[PDB]
């Protein structure tokens, strides 16, 4: 089914706890001895309670695991698990006649195959989208049984690939959710300022079902807007509303109560409005420049180091954030959580948002295309109005080649026609193109607003003092935006500034490489990596690294490392300066 | 470097003991964030004690292993793990000018990359038969370093390929060993019974190095052998010798020492005498007529589970055999350990020895078959002087195709061209043709000595009743030998004999299919599944298989279950019956 | 309720396999919040079918243990775990009426409660002695309950206390066994030689039932015995038979099928005959002046270092014993299994057995007294016909105090009054009296008929140098016994001879430490600690010991150490000097 927009305000229940599991790394429950899909299959769950006759599996009697989560954190066996899980859920439903019923999935990591009733509803690849499948239909009386056979091994033609620098976190990560809607429901809308313009709402309302041409209502009372419309044939309709809205802002995010009411079906919403656009290498917000104090957050929870999924970890998260001095968040390396963009919208954050078309992507496979384009198109269509992101992002550190290079303006182009307020970015790298002299030299930088890229000088390419002896210039008049910098230590772990992962030398490192990025023409954004350490299967210096990327300014644990507060500092800087 | 022939009866000295590991499923060790190989991974073994340097990993301060053995048994992460673990050895060796030295691993699951000192070594597939490297030039004074990348990933062109029915034991699962020899060397014998001929020894011998020109003596001190020959140009010498050993059989084991000594090299081997042929339905050991009463087996451990590889393992596991009336194992599916041959050898077990060949081989893959024969080369190479192996086995359970027969028709033409005395099985299939009437209907049959096959009548083909109601024929006066059969249960779980998994319903199959079995013409040997319960990813019924295969006649923990001793007391009728 | 000698001869039914559990440290099933003792605890084994009622546990959908072993090495969470886990089973038995039903636990570490169907049957303490209880009349058709509450917790008033050097495995650490037996039974015998008598076997038989007065024959075919005896009122008959019986030697382990019968009961045996007894500085056996060449062995696996209890885990370390040159084992520090002493007495061993009388007992509480004295009499009981024992031990290293002779005392006096033949021993210390001067100074000596004491000069007392300079003295003429000695070594760690923990520091330690022993007046036996690397809390040196006493001679994965071939060497030179 196609994607319901806003799930958590319909009328929704859930379906997380803890359900049965299998961990079936051969497949058994899907592959017969000759490699043959067979019947009989996990997917029946049967319980075994007659042992005259013969099977090799009960969900009924087997182990749990929470849903929703990664599995990595819940078992030591399955800290590297990669491979089939089934998950078994047992649920009862009184769905009253011509109301129907969806089964929505927040996320699942990599591939997801759903029964209900033992009937397939169908299939999911990509770990970070949601998908949904209408069970109006198939839902029984009494107990209904949900086989979910969730994999994640990695694919060499999948996005991502089989090569990247974060944990192959598996399973249910995000909520299950139960959504009732009336027979014809208001499935999607869009409700936004229209480009460069302040004073103009525009959007449109798309409705599912037979009753498809209605009379729809959009209803902002604040702004006392009241705009009536017809949906055409299709269940379609646009609009455009005249309007002077207060304009959010990380210092004043205001967000207006916005009502959608069919003659079937009401919706609400908290959107803001904005406008964003580049001049130069100014990034103008509501016409103001601005400055992204930035950070970069994986999709990790404080403490424990699991997949986040709940307003608890996002509001953990961005408090630290907050505690930093930012006014932006790049939510790397794909589309996280929703939880997690609303708490950005509320509290404050600029949002860049990115799927995961990461290092070594098989540029030249056209399901690899498609999947990430796909990817692309559920990324936009879940937060098109969420006013705080301001960039989608279509990659992540990519090697220059021209099948590469195809690839990517696809995408760009793509998400142009999707979205033509935001801003397309990209994260490239710098090169040394003679000593001293730093810059980014991609193709790709023509298809992009702004000049966004990764570069760690003084971690990767020199030590600390390098920073003071490299300046950087581009020859494009583009916002400079650097989406990654920094690097390692462990929280606790104190020397000489000159040993590497002790908290001095990343402090060094951040004081001298500050002074750097204050001599870059054109920055317009920082969000150095990373906010919080993280799990990486790429990180094995005993006790300093063990499985984790370092590179927080806060531990896994919540401490803020020394260099937590010279960025602070510099944040409180620009701060000041672009008041 | 070619095989080495009878390793443990050399200058051995052994690197097992437990050896710094770094788990890597990325393979970060390997590839850089490009994909590619790069200078600096961890087969340089840089110890990061200068840390004013950046790398990501410390061999020096990481967690240990055990060697030998799987990793899957030493930690919880372990459990399912498929993917790549680097082992480190750090070792001195005072190499006398002159001597050559061999690093020789006796298996490795399943691709191995091996360097010295930095410097890679070469590289290995196949998880269950050894491999050597000559290291004679590449030993430094002081500290050596030892690097094995080894990796258990399942390959769909592997043999075996992504499914079979037993644990993906990843590791170094046999014993690490320095081979010291003289500058030229005896590498590699054979001393057996020419074929038929119970007063005929027959045999040569192989040097290597640059004195290949060598008078050679072989020497069987008990029978006043004493045969001098000379090497051609090659360093090859072929010998006949008239003589009457003592011929070995199950109930008189009887080895003789055998020793070689050339002008540069000797070595000693203890060495026993057969023959073995068909006539018809029967098989003739020492021109008698045997009953094969087997037993399967599995190479792991009683108790715990793991990879076997000691002689304790072997002598514990054989012990049961003997007492289950067995003068017979079928050692499945796989070449096993070098201590389990040997062991069935002193104690008076005839041996199936098998190459995993194993369900659906990629048939029309020349490297497939490239690497199935190799290891058909060297399960033979290795174990040519045991005279109680009398069956090699080449393949199991293999779908008919096309392809398919080419495939193992080359397997056993290239197995007839290294042994001509030998019988060459492979474990059929059987089909029902109709109701009641059971036979084999293979093409490969045609190229096998005897009718082999694996039938489960009474587990999966029906309840145990269906085995009073079967008949079996053959077109073919071949012996017929069933080389699987059996059932599941728990010991200690009892109940009615219609409930599967009870030791009950266990036991009253045995008794019907041990029925079945004395109404079938032609039978001249039985090795049921399984000795003992062993573990497999394919077993998930919880509380009663927990990833165990439960058709052991004795559980897992050493215990006998009921069905034991009906197998037990029709051997015991066979002993008496072929007397 | 008392002792049933022979158990694996009698009519039995394992109860061994997997039983459901619960772990309960602060032991909710047991005690209320008011910290009392309530009915409708756990021992109810009550399935929690009705969830309209409230409980707070449930065997029947827990998780499984397997009977026997201990609970540590089963699941990462019992590593440690000291305190109550709970132990369900449920099984049927038809027992004809008339007939008699027991259930007898092989042993429990070390507190067990027992309930059959909710009623309480009795409990025990001591974790290494075997414990009965007649259920005759509690048994119910159908399902029955076995419920046992077992603890391990450490006691200060407890035998052993709360320290010791060996791990505390917890649990059902030995065979569960049901025993049907007639109303009047054959419970209790005794067949040996008279003592210093190689011509008289003696004995006695002991009924239990309502019929105690019978007629017996005693019948040992071999021997062409056949006694006669009627049984008392009390149902207790001895003997005195002439015979000339081939006498039990560790070169030929001699054993005669003997064969009890009464009126309603009959068993077999497999008893040997020996003569022991000491000659001023000499022990003699069968006569013949004999060198105890022994090792010291904890009840602990080889390759996953759990609980020992079956024939095969006997018969793999005996075999390494026996590769040692050893024709002695000192079964340290408690009972051992009955499988590893029958072991023992069938390969020739001959064995030291003690009670866990280990370093600070509570000399002064009388409850601690009965304990020991209790735990001898059930060592003695079960084993006084396996003639390979000659040395039975009440205590090791205990600190002297006039209480703690006295202790010692009334043991030494309690063992002579069960056993008139055996020699009595207890593990002493050394003390070095003048400089360079070593004795025993201990008043208990006196009391026992060897000089045994534990010493480790080389190790904890000097390097490996103070062998070499340090003389010993005796001011008795009893036969000197160094019950324990030796030094700490890696498998695979290797270095200079003056590192320890090195192979090489082992090796030069036990040449030093032979060369030594030469010079020791009156020595007439060694059992080194110890054959196998085995479990230990008080061993951390991290990637050396990791909780493992490493001073075996071999290590925990079954390989031999350099110094294994030293204490070889010296064992092959005392066997021919001894022939
Ligand atoms: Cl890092
Ligand atoms: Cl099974
Ligand atoms: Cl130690």
Known sequence: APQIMNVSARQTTSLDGQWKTIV??????YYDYRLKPYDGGY?????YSDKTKLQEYDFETDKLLFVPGDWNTQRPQLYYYEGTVWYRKHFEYSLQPGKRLFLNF????YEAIVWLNGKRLGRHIGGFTPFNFEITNLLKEGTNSLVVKVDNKRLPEAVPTVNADWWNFGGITRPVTLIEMPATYIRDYYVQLAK????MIEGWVQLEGSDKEQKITLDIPELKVKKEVTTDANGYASFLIKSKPILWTPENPKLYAVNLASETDKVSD????????TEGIKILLNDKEIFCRGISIHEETPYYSGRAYSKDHA???LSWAKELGCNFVRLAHYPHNEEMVREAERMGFLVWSEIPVYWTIHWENKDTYQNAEQ???????RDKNRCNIIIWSIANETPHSKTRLTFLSNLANKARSLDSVRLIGAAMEKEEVQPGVLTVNDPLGELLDIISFNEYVGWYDGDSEKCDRVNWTFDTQKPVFISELGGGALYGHHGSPKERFTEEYQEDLYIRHVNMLKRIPGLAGTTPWILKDFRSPRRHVPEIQDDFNRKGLVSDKGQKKKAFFVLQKWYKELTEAYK
């Open 24 to 29: 079936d790394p051969f497949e058994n429950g």
């Open 315 to 317: 509001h953990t998260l």
């Open 106 to 109: 927040g996320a699942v990591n």
């Open 43 to 47: 997917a029946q769950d049967k319980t």
């Open 270 to 277: 908290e959107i803001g409005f904005r406008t964003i656009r």
């Open 196 to 199: 460069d313009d302040k004073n």
């Open 375 to 381: 990817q692309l198109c559920d990324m936009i269509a």
